[model samples]
Target: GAREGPKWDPARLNESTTFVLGSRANKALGMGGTRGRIYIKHPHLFKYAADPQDKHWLAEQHHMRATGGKMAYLLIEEDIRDLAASDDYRGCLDLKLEELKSFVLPSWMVEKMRKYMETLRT
Candidate 1:
């Protein structure tokens, strides 16, 4: 039987791509490994990449799947509408984004998000 891949949809990518980690991913990071639990279950933003050939894009997806396990809803973007609903949610988003920027992520992906962040501020 042929395995089916996800329906590739360029439109699924968001301007500020947000990824939330699950419990399995949290455990993979070890105690205080995810930087003071700042990243666990928190939505970290990335830049939208529609290219199938992009290495950082591929790497991020792979890492999320490997550590996140069966229950992990990895790569799927969070609800932007829900996130924009309150100051609390927006503040948390900013915090998570700051924390994620401090981590040693793929340099190219980091630059991508950095560029997006710059765009947002203006």
Candidate 2:
């Protein structure tokens, strides 16, 4: 059998530019970019990537994985939806986008929901 080679995705705009260290560039390639839909359908069972002792790391792993769309243990996006919804909060109804910025997804991936409806945590 032939040995396996890494994925090769050349840049179209930059001619034949491609990376040799593909994994480094796509370290977070899993969760969606890495695995397909059915594979991660039941993500709770895929915590093998994390240790089984700490116990805390499992949920934390789920958190990061959910950040990638795990959508459990209260998906951060769901957190966003409630904020946009007429839902109640601590002595209030509806939170502010500013409030979320300092909290979840402070400065990454995005609050794509902010642009659309309730979802982005964004």
Q: What is the lDDT of residue 120 in candidate 2?
A: 25
Model 2, 75-112: lDDT tens per residue? 23222222222212222322222222111322222233
Return the TM-score for candidate 1, rounded to 2 decimals.
Answer: 0.25
Error of 1 at 104 (Å): 5.1
The local lDDT score (0 to 100) that residue 11 gets in candidate 1 is 36
For candidate 2, what is the TM-score? 0.18
- Lowest lDDT sum, 10 consecutive residues, model 1, at 1-10
- Per-residue lDDT of 62-106 in model 1, one digit per residue for the tens? 464342333322233333223323334333323322121111335
Candidate 1: regions farther than 4 A off: 1-56, 59-104
lDDT for each of the candidates? 0.35, 0.24
Error of 1 at 54 (Å): 3.9
Report the Cα lDDT for candidate 2: 0.24
Give the best candidate by lDDT: 1
Candidate 2: segments with Cα more than 4 A from true spot: 1-55, 58-72, 87-94, 101-122
